Amino acid sequence: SKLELLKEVYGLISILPILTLLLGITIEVLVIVWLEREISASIQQRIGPE
Amino acid sequence: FLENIQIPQRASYIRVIMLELSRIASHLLWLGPFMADLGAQTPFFYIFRERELIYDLFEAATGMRMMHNYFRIGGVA
């Protein structure tokens, strides 16, 4: 039979692309903080976070 | 200057060079930080880059970094 739900237990959602977006936004946060700490404090200054 | 140990005018001119360079030593170490207080966010390191040469001067003149001990009693160091 079909007592409660056959194909509707948990297999309708995938959490791969959301985690890919998470990884991408974290990497971009790293990129932008690198941009800041390497351009703002290096216009007429020494190099950034070496 | 009290007991009149006669200071030559040449050494006096040397001391004048000293004093009129300390005028700069004060102008920078106010305006730079004054720029960093008023709202001038960038020129903080700029005035230090300008001041770097006074460091070499004070070092090579009499003392370590602040030119310490450039005034003895009978004249200068």
Side-chain angles (χ1 to χ4, degrees), chain A residues 11-31 33-44 47-50, chain B residues 1 3-12 14 16-41 43-46 50-55 57-65 68 70-71 74-77:
Chain A
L12 302 197
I13 296 297
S14 282
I15 60 178
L16 273 296
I18 304 101
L19 200 143
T20 74
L21 315 172
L22 262 56
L23 298 200
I25 62 170
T26 51
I27 294 168
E28 288 300 328
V29 165
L30 318 173
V31 186
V33 61
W34 200 95
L35 255 68
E36 206 59 270
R37 305 301 316 282
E38 289 269 8
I39 296 155
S40 276
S42 88
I43 44 172
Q44 173 66 277
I47 193 163
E50 213 186 10
Chain B
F1 162 72
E3 291 186 61
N4 288 21
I5 306 90
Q6 203 63 92
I7 301 93
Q9 278 66 236
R10 186 250 176 186
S12 291
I14 307 172
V16 165
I17 283 191
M18 302 178 205
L19 165 75
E20 303 319 322
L21 191 45
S22 51
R23 308 259 191 257
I24 289 310
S26 42
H27 269 306
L28 318 181
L29 302 167
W30 175 73
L31 183 45
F34 173 57
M35 285 286 248
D37 309 330
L38 72 87
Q41 62 261 38
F44 183 88
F45 313 127
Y46 280 23
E50 312 278 4
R51 184 169 174 242
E52 313 289 14
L53 182 145
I54 302 90
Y55 304 147
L57 269 59
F58 275 148
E59 186 273 347
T62 43
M64 295 65 73
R65 176 56 67 213
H68 301 283
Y70 56 93
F71 264 115
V76 295

Tab-separated table of all heavy atoms in Angstrom, chain B residues 7-67, unseen atoms left out:
chain	number	residue	atom	x	y	z
B	7	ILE	N	78.820	81.863	25.204
B	7	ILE	CA	78.482	80.964	24.107
B	7	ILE	C	78.821	81.671	22.802
B	7	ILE	O	78.310	82.772	22.548
B	7	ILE	CB	77.000	80.560	24.144
B	7	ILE	CG1	76.661	79.868	25.466
B	7	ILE	CG2	76.666	79.658	22.967
B	7	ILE	CD1	76.145	80.811	26.540
B	8	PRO	N	79.682	81.100	21.963
B	8	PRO	CA	79.980	81.730	20.675
B	8	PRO	C	78.722	81.908	19.841
B	8	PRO	O	77.716	81.218	20.021
B	8	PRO	CB	80.950	80.745	20.015
B	8	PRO	CG	81.570	80.022	21.160
B	8	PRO	CD	80.489	79.891	22.186
B	9	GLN	N	78.790	82.859	18.911
B	9	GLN	CA	77.670	83.097	18.011
B	9	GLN	C	77.531	82.003	16.960
B	9	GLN	O	76.427	81.790	16.450
B	9	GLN	CB	77.817	84.461	17.334
B	9	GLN	CG	77.336	85.637	18.180
B	9	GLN	CD	78.176	85.853	19.426
B	9	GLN	OE1	77.658	85.863	20.543
B	9	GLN	NE2	79.479	86.024	19.240
B	10	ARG	N	78.619	81.301	16.637
B	10	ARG	CA	78.532	80.182	15.704
B	10	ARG	C	77.802	78.999	16.332
B	10	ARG	O	76.879	78.435	15.732
B	10	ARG	CB	79.935	79.780	15.246
B	10	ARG	CG	79.954	78.728	14.155
B	10	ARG	CD	80.465	77.402	14.682
B	10	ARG	NE	80.414	76.354	13.669
B	10	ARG	CZ	80.686	75.076	13.908
B	10	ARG	NH1	81.033	74.693	15.127
B	10	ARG	NH2	80.616	74.183	12.930
B	11	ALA	N	78.208	78.604	17.542
B	11	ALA	CA	77.460	77.585	18.270
B	11	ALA	C	76.035	78.043	18.553
B	11	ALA	O	75.110	77.221	18.586
B	11	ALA	CB	78.175	77.236	19.574
B	12	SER	N	75.840	79.347	18.751
B	12	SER	CA	74.491	79.879	18.905
B	12	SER	C	73.671	79.667	17.639
B	12	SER	O	72.489	79.316	17.707
B	12	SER	CB	74.555	81.362	19.263
B	12	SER	OG	75.079	81.549	20.565
B	13	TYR	N	74.281	79.873	16.470
B	13	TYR	CA	73.582	79.620	15.215
B	13	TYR	C	73.289	78.136	15.035
B	13	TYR	O	72.261	77.763	14.460
B	13	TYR	CB	74.406	80.141	14.043
B	14	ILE	N	74.200	77.276	15.494
B	14	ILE	CA	73.928	75.839	15.483
B	14	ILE	C	72.695	75.534	16.326
B	14	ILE	O	71.798	74.789	15.910
B	14	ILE	CB	75.156	75.050	15.973
B	14	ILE	CG1	76.401	75.443	15.179
B	14	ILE	CG2	74.914	73.558	15.841
B	14	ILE	CD1	77.680	74.854	15.729
B	15	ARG	N	72.633	76.114	17.527
B	15	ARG	CA	71.459	75.941	18.378
B	15	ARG	C	70.209	76.533	17.736
B	15	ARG	O	69.100	76.049	17.978
B	15	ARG	CB	71.706	76.573	19.748
B	16	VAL	N	70.368	77.572	16.917
B	16	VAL	CA	69.227	78.138	16.204
B	16	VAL	C	68.722	77.164	15.148
B	16	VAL	O	67.511	76.991	14.969
B	16	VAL	CB	69.600	79.498	15.587
B	16	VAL	CG1	68.564	79.921	14.555
B	16	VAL	CG2	69.730	80.551	16.672
B	17	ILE	N	69.644	76.542	14.409
B	17	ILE	CA	69.276	75.456	13.501
B	17	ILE	C	68.490	74.393	14.257
B	17	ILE	O	67.430	73.935	13.812
B	17	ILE	CB	70.529	74.855	12.839
B	17	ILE	CG1	71.041	75.763	11.722
B	17	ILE	CG2	70.234	73.460	12.303
B	17	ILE	CD1	72.105	75.117	10.863
B	18	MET	N	69.011	73.993	15.419
B	18	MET	CA	68.323	73.014	16.256
B	18	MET	C	66.897	73.456	16.566
B	18	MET	O	65.937	72.708	16.351
B	18	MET	CB	69.098	72.797	17.558
B	18	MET	CG	70.534	72.334	17.411
B	18	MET	SD	71.299	72.179	19.038
B	18	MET	CE	73.031	72.380	18.639
B	19	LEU	N	66.747	74.677	17.081
B	19	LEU	CA	65.449	75.145	17.552
B	19	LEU	C	64.453	75.273	16.404
B	19	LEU	O	63.283	74.890	16.535
B	19	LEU	CB	65.623	76.475	18.282
B	19	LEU	CG	64.396	77.333	18.570
B	19	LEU	CD1	63.597	76.725	19.705
B	19	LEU	CD2	64.825	78.750	18.913
B	20	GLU	N	64.901	75.795	15.263
B	20	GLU	CA	64.019	75.961	14.119
B	20	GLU	C	63.753	74.653	13.385
B	20	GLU	O	62.838	74.604	12.556
B	20	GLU	CB	64.602	77.000	13.159
B	20	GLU	CG	64.865	78.374	13.789
B	20	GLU	CD	63.769	78.857	14.733
B	20	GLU	OE1	62.572	78.622	14.459
B	20	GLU	OE2	64.112	79.478	15.761
B	21	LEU	N	64.523	73.599	13.662
B	21	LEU	CA	64.126	72.262	13.241
B	21	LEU	C	63.162	71.619	14.228
B	21	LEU	O	62.308	70.820	13.831
B	21	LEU	CB	65.357	71.368	13.068
B	21	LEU	CG	65.115	70.016	12.392
B	21	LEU	CD1	64.228	70.174	11.167
B	21	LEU	CD2	66.430	69.355	12.018
B	22	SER	N	63.279	71.957	15.512
B	22	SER	CA	62.303	71.476	16.484
B	22	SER	C	60.937	72.109	16.257
B	22	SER	O	59.910	71.501	16.580
B	22	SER	CB	62.787	71.752	17.903
B	22	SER	OG	63.170	73.103	18.059
B	23	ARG	N	60.908	73.335	15.731
B	23	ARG	CA	59.644	73.909	15.280
B	23	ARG	C	58.937	72.956	14.320
B	23	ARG	O	57.731	72.710	14.441
B	23	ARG	CB	59.882	75.266	14.615
B	23	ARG	CG	60.690	76.239	15.454
B	23	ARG	CD	59.823	77.276	16.145
B	23	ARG	NE	60.635	78.343	16.721
B	23	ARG	CZ	60.925	78.447	18.014
B	23	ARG	NH1	60.462	77.553	18.875
B	23	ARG	NH2	61.676	79.449	18.449
B	24	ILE	N	59.686	72.393	13.369
B	24	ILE	CA	59.135	71.382	12.469
B	24	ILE	C	58.776	70.117	13.236
B	24	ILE	O	57.728	69.503	13.001
B	24	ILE	CB	60.135	71.085	11.336
B	24	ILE	CG1	60.212	72.264	10.371
B	24	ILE	CG2	59.752	69.814	10.596
B	24	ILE	CD1	58.862	72.732	9.916
B	25	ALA	N	59.653	69.694	14.150
B	25	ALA	CA	59.397	68.484	14.925
B	25	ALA	C	58.085	68.575	15.691
B	25	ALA	O	57.469	67.549	15.997
B	25	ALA	CB	60.556	68.222	15.889
B	26	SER	N	57.643	69.790	16.001
B	26	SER	CA	56.350	70.009	16.639
B	26	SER	C	55.224	70.168	15.620
B	26	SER	O	54.127	69.631	15.819
B	26	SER	CB	56.419	71.247	17.535
B	26	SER	OG	57.135	72.282	16.888
B	27	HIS	N	55.481	70.903	14.534
B	27	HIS	CA	54.460	71.115	13.513
B	27	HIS	C	53.968	69.792	12.942
B	27	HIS	O	52.759	69.585	12.797
B	27	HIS	CB	55.008	72.007	12.400
B	27	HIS	CG	54.761	73.467	12.618
B	27	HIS	ND1	53.505	73.983	12.854
B	27	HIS	CD2	55.610	74.522	12.638
B	27	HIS	CE1	53.591	75.292	13.010
B	27	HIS	NE2	54.857	75.645	12.882
B	28	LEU	N	54.889	68.889	12.605
B	28	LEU	CA	54.489	67.580	12.093
B	28	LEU	C	53.714	66.793	13.145
B	28	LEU	O	52.548	66.434	12.943
B	28	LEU	CB	55.715	66.791	11.627
B	28	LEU	CG	56.803	67.525	10.846
B	28	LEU	CD1	57.913	66.566	10.454
B	28	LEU	CD2	56.227	68.212	9.621
B	29	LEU	N	54.349	66.531	14.291
B	29	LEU	CA	53.728	65.734	15.344
B	29	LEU	C	52.501	66.389	15.959
B	29	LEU	O	51.957	65.836	16.919
B	29	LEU	CB	54.737	65.404	16.445
B	29	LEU	CG	55.984	64.655	15.992
B	29	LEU	CD1	57.045	64.655	17.082
B	29	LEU	CD2	55.586	63.242	15.614
B	30	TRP	N	52.080	67.557	15.480
B	30	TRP	CA	50.708	67.982	15.731
B	30	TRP	C	49.812	67.817	14.510
B	30	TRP	O	48.768	67.168	14.601
B	30	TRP	CB	50.645	69.437	16.198
B	30	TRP	CG	49.224	69.884	16.326
B	30	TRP	CD1	48.337	69.513	17.291
B	30	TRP	CD2	48.508	70.743	15.432
B	30	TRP	NE1	47.121	70.110	17.073
B	30	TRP	CE2	47.199	70.868	15.935
B	30	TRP	CE3	48.850	71.427	14.262
B	30	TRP	CZ2	46.231	71.650	15.311
B	30	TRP	CZ3	47.886	72.199	13.643
B	30	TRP	CH2	46.595	72.309	14.170
B	31	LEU	N	50.202	68.391	13.366
B	31	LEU	CA	49.315	68.433	12.208
B	31	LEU	C	48.947	67.034	11.732
B	31	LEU	O	47.782	66.772	11.410
B	31	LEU	CB	49.968	69.230	11.078
B	31	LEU	CG	49.142	69.449	9.807
B	31	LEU	CD1	47.714	69.852	10.144
B	31	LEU	CD2	49.797	70.491	8.912
B	32	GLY	N	49.921	66.127	11.670
B	32	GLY	CA	49.652	64.753	11.313
B	32	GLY	C	48.560	64.142	12.166
B	32	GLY	O	47.508	63.724	11.669
B	33	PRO	N	48.794	64.068	13.477
B	33	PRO	CA	47.708	63.660	14.379
B	33	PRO	C	46.519	64.599	14.340
B	33	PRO	O	45.385	64.141	14.511
B	33	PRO	CB	48.374	63.641	15.762
B	33	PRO	CG	49.675	64.326	15.597
B	33	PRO	CD	50.084	64.171	14.176
B	34	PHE	N	46.724	65.900	14.118
B	34	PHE	CA	45.573	66.780	13.941
B	34	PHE	C	44.793	66.405	12.689
B	34	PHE	O	43.564	66.517	12.660
B	34	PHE	CB	46.000	68.243	13.873
B	34	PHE	CG	44.878	69.176	13.516
B	34	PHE	CD1	43.728	69.217	14.286
B	34	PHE	CD2	44.963	69.995	12.406
B	34	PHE	CE1	42.690	70.063	13.960
B	34	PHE	CE2	43.929	70.849	12.077
B	34	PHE	CZ	42.790	70.882	12.855
B	35	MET	N	45.492	65.970	11.640
B	35	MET	CA	44.797	65.474	10.458
B	35	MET	C	44.035	64.194	10.778
B	35	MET	O	42.925	63.982	10.279
B	35	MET	CB	45.791	65.245	9.319
B	35	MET	CG	46.279	66.524	8.645
B	35	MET	SD	45.062	67.309	7.573
B	35	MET	CE	45.820	67.069	5.968
B	36	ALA	N	44.612	63.336	11.622
B	36	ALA	CA	43.956	62.098	12.026
B	36	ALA	C	42.857	62.311	13.061
B	36	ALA	O	42.152	61.353	13.394
B	36	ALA	CB	44.988	61.111	12.575
B	37	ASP	N	42.733	63.516	13.612
B	37	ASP	CA	41.615	63.868	14.483
B	37	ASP	C	40.511	64.628	13.759
B	37	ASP	O	39.327	64.379	14.014
B	37	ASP	CB	42.090	64.709	15.674
B	37	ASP	CG	43.264	64.089	16.397
B	37	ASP	OD1	43.368	62.845	16.409
B	37	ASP	OD2	44.086	64.846	16.956
B	38	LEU	N	40.869	65.556	12.869
B	38	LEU	CA	39.864	66.395	12.223
B	38	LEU	C	38.994	65.588	11.269
B	38	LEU	O	37.791	65.842	11.155
B	38	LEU	CB	40.542	67.561	11.494
B	38	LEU	CG	41.349	67.336	10.205
B	38	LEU	CD1	40.470	67.381	8.960
B	38	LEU	CD2	42.471	68.355	10.090
B	39	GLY	N	39.578	64.610	10.584
B	39	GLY	CA	38.837	63.850	9.598
B	39	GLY	C	39.673	63.421	8.411
B	39	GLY	O	39.220	62.622	7.587
B	40	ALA	N	40.897	63.931	8.315
B	40	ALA	CA	41.813	63.530	7.249
B	40	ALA	C	42.319	62.128	7.554
B	40	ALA	O	43.269	61.943	8.318
B	40	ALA	CB	42.962	64.523	7.127
B	41	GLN	N	41.677	61.126	6.951
B	41	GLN	CA	41.934	59.740	7.323
B	41	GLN	C	43.229	59.206	6.718
B	41	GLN	O	43.950	58.443	7.370
B	41	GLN	CB	40.743	58.874	6.911
B	41	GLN	CG	40.479	58.853	5.414
B	41	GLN	CD	39.375	59.801	4.990
B	41	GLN	OE1	39.252	60.904	5.516
B	41	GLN	NE2	38.567	59.374	4.027
B	42	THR	N	43.544	59.590	5.483
B	42	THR	CA	44.701	59.033	4.790
B	42	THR	C	46.051	59.634	5.197
B	42	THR	O	47.019	58.876	5.335
B	42	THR	CB	44.508	59.127	3.268
B	43	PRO	N	46.190	60.971	5.404
B	43	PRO	CA	47.543	61.546	5.471
B	43	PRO	C	48.311	61.207	6.741
B	43	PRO	O	49.387	61.767	6.972
B	43	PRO	CB	47.286	63.059	5.380
B	43	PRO	CG	45.812	63.207	5.087
B	43	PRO	CD	45.196	62.011	5.709
B	44	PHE	N	47.771	60.316	7.577
B	44	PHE	CA	48.453	59.940	8.812
B	44	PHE	C	49.853	59.409	8.528
B	44	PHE	O	50.850	59.943	9.027
B	44	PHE	CB	47.623	58.906	9.577
B	44	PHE	CG	48.219	58.508	10.900
B	44	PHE	CD1	47.923	59.224	12.049
B	44	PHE	CD2	49.065	57.416	10.999
B	44	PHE	CE1	48.467	58.863	13.269
B	44	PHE	CE2	49.611	57.050	12.215
B	44	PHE	CZ	49.312	57.774	13.351
B	45	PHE	N	49.947	58.349	7.723
B	45	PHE	CA	51.249	57.802	7.359
B	45	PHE	C	52.043	58.747	6.465
B	45	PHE	O	53.277	58.651	6.419
B	45	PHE	CB	51.075	56.453	6.661
B	45	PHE	CG	50.135	55.520	7.370
B	45	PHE	CD1	49.070	54.943	6.697
B	45	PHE	CD2	50.314	55.218	8.709
B	45	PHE	CE1	48.205	54.082	7.343
B	45	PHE	CE2	49.452	54.359	9.361
B	45	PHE	CZ	48.396	53.791	8.678
B	46	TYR	N	51.362	59.649	5.754
B	46	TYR	CA	52.050	60.579	4.864
B	46	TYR	C	53.025	61.458	5.638
B	46	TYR	O	54.191	61.608	5.249
B	46	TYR	CB	51.030	61.442	4.118
B	46	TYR	CG	50.385	60.774	2.923
B	46	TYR	CD1	50.330	59.391	2.814
B	46	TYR	CD2	49.825	61.532	1.902
B	46	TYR	CE1	49.736	58.782	1.722
B	46	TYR	CE2	49.231	60.932	0.807
B	46	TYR	CZ	49.190	59.558	0.722
B	46	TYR	OH	48.600	58.956	-0.366
B	47	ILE	N	52.568	62.042	6.748
B	47	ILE	CA	53.426	62.960	7.487
B	47	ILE	C	54.549	62.206	8.188
B	47	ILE	O	55.633	62.757	8.399
B	47	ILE	CB	52.596	63.807	8.470
B	48	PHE	N	54.331	60.936	8.539
B	48	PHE	CA	55.430	60.134	9.069
B	48	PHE	C	56.481	59.881	7.996
B	48	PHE	O	57.689	59.954	8.266
B	48	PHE	CB	54.899	58.815	9.626
B	49	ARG	N	56.035	59.580	6.772
B	49	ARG	CA	56.964	59.425	5.658
B	49	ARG	C	57.746	60.710	5.417
B	49	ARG	O	58.930	60.671	5.062
B	49	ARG	CB	56.208	59.009	4.396
B	50	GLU	N	57.096	61.861	5.596
B	50	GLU	CA	57.816	63.129	5.496
B	50	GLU	C	58.814	63.289	6.637
B	50	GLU	O	59.933	63.774	6.430
B	50	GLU	CB	56.835	64.305	5.482
B	50	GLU	CG	55.676	64.160	4.510
B	50	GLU	CD	56.041	64.536	3.088
B	50	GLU	OE1	57.224	64.843	2.834
B	50	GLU	OE2	55.142	64.524	2.222
B	51	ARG	N	58.430	62.877	7.848
B	51	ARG	CA	59.258	63.089	9.028
B	51	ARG	C	60.473	62.169	9.073
B	51	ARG	O	61.431	62.473	9.794
B	51	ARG	CB	58.409	62.903	10.292
B	51	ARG	CG	59.132	63.188	11.603
B	51	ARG	CD	58.173	63.233	12.783
B	51	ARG	NE	58.883	63.377	14.052
B	51	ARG	CZ	58.850	62.486	15.037
B	51	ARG	NH1	58.143	61.372	14.903
B	51	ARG	NH2	59.532	62.702	16.153
B	52	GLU	N	60.454	61.057	8.327
B	52	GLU	CA	61.536	60.071	8.407
B	52	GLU	C	62.931	60.691	8.371
B	52	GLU	O	63.853	60.185	9.022
B	52	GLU	CB	61.419	59.048	7.272
B	52	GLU	CG	60.036	58.462	7.058
B	52	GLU	CD	59.598	57.501	8.154
B	52	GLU	OE1	60.230	57.470	9.229
B	52	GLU	OE2	58.607	56.774	7.940
B	53	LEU	N	63.111	61.778	7.618
B	53	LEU	CA	64.437	62.369	7.461
B	53	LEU	C	64.914	63.057	8.739
B	53	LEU	O	66.118	63.052	9.039
B	53	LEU	CB	64.412	63.331	6.271
B	53	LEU	CG	65.673	64.067	5.829
B	53	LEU	CD1	65.682	64.226	4.314
B	53	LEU	CD2	65.708	65.431	6.509
B	54	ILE	N	63.994	63.652	9.500
B	54	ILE	CA	64.365	64.244	10.781
B	54	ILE	C	64.907	63.181	11.732
B	54	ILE	O	65.741	63.478	12.595
B	54	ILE	CB	63.172	65.011	11.390
B	54	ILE	CG1	62.679	66.105	10.434
B	54	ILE	CG2	63.550	65.643	12.717
B	54	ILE	CD1	61.608	65.678	9.455
B	55	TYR	N	64.469	61.928	11.581
B	55	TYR	CA	65.021	60.855	12.403
B	55	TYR	C	66.503	60.662	12.119
B	55	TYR	O	67.323	60.592	13.043
B	55	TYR	CB	64.262	59.551	12.164
B	55	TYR	CG	62.779	59.652	12.409
B	55	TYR	CD1	61.880	58.901	11.669
B	55	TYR	CD2	62.280	60.496	13.389
B	55	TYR	CE1	60.526	58.994	11.892
B	55	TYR	CE2	60.932	60.593	13.617
B	55	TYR	CZ	60.057	59.841	12.868
B	55	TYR	OH	58.707	59.939	13.098
B	56	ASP	N	66.864	60.566	10.837
B	56	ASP	CA	68.269	60.438	10.472
B	56	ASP	C	69.069	61.636	10.959
B	56	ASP	O	70.202	61.484	11.434
B	56	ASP	CB	68.406	60.279	8.960
B	57	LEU	N	68.496	62.837	10.853
B	57	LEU	CA	69.194	64.032	11.323
B	57	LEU	C	69.464	63.972	12.825
B	57	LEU	O	70.605	64.151	13.272
B	57	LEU	CB	68.399	65.288	10.963
B	57	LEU	CG	68.728	65.940	9.617
B	57	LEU	CD1	68.519	64.990	8.458
B	57	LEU	CD2	67.921	67.219	9.423
B	58	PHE	N	68.417	63.747	13.624
B	58	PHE	CA	68.588	63.696	15.073
B	58	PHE	C	69.528	62.570	15.483
B	58	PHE	O	70.271	62.698	16.462
B	58	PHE	CB	67.234	63.539	15.764
B	58	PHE	CG	66.511	64.833	15.983
B	58	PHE	CD1	65.128	64.882	15.948
B	58	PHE	CD2	67.211	65.997	16.246
B	58	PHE	CE1	64.459	66.070	16.159
B	58	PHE	CE2	66.548	67.185	16.455
B	58	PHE	CZ	65.170	67.223	16.414
B	59	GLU	N	69.509	61.455	14.749
B	59	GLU	CA	70.412	60.357	15.062
B	59	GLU	C	71.859	60.744	14.789
B	59	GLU	O	72.721	60.635	15.670
B	59	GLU	CB	70.021	59.115	14.260
B	59	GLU	CG	70.804	57.861	14.621
B	59	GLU	CD	72.092	57.739	13.843
B	59	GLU	OE1	72.248	58.484	12.855
B	59	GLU	OE2	72.948	56.913	14.222
B	60	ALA	N	72.147	61.203	13.569
B	60	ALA	CA	73.516	61.515	13.185
B	60	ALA	C	74.053	62.773	13.851
B	60	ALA	O	75.260	63.024	13.762
B	60	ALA	CB	73.614	61.660	11.665
B	61	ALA	N	73.210	63.567	14.514
B	61	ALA	CA	73.710	64.811	15.099
B	61	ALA	C	74.395	64.573	16.443
B	61	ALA	O	75.603	64.784	16.581
B	61	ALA	CB	72.563	65.817	15.242
B	62	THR	N	73.637	64.142	17.449
B	62	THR	CA	74.232	63.899	18.762
B	62	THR	C	73.826	62.575	19.394
B	62	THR	O	74.658	61.934	20.043
B	62	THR	CB	73.877	65.044	19.719
B	62	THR	OG1	72.499	65.394	19.547
B	62	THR	CG2	74.753	66.260	19.445
B	63	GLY	N	72.577	62.146	19.223
B	63	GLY	CA	72.060	61.059	20.033
B	63	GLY	C	71.349	59.950	19.284
B	63	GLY	O	71.356	59.917	18.050
B	64	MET	N	70.738	59.030	20.031
B	64	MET	CA	70.183	57.806	19.462
B	64	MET	C	69.037	58.065	18.490
B	64	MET	O	69.170	57.813	17.290
B	64	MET	CB	69.707	56.886	20.587
B	64	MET	CG	70.829	56.378	21.468
B	64	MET	SD	71.615	57.728	22.370
B	64	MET	CE	70.349	58.115	23.576
B	65	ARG	N	67.912	58.556	18.992
B	65	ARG	CA	66.792	58.869	18.110
B	65	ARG	C	66.226	60.258	18.343
B	65	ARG	O	65.887	60.949	17.378
B	65	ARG	CB	65.684	57.817	18.280
B	65	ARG	CG	64.429	58.090	17.468
B	65	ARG	CD	64.755	58.243	15.991
B	65	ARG	NE	65.233	56.998	15.401
B	65	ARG	CZ	66.125	56.936	14.418
B	65	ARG	NH1	66.640	58.050	13.917
B	65	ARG	NH2	66.506	55.760	13.938
B	66	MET	N	66.123	60.691	19.597
B	66	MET	CA	65.683	62.035	19.931
B	66	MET	C	66.848	63.006	20.053
B	66	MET	O	66.676	64.103	20.598
B	66	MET	CB	64.869	62.016	21.226
B	67	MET	N	68.025	62.618	19.559
B	67	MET	CA	69.241	63.427	19.596
B	67	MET	C	69.687	63.749	21.016
B	67	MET	O	70.388	64.740	21.228
B	67	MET	CB	69.078	64.722	18.793
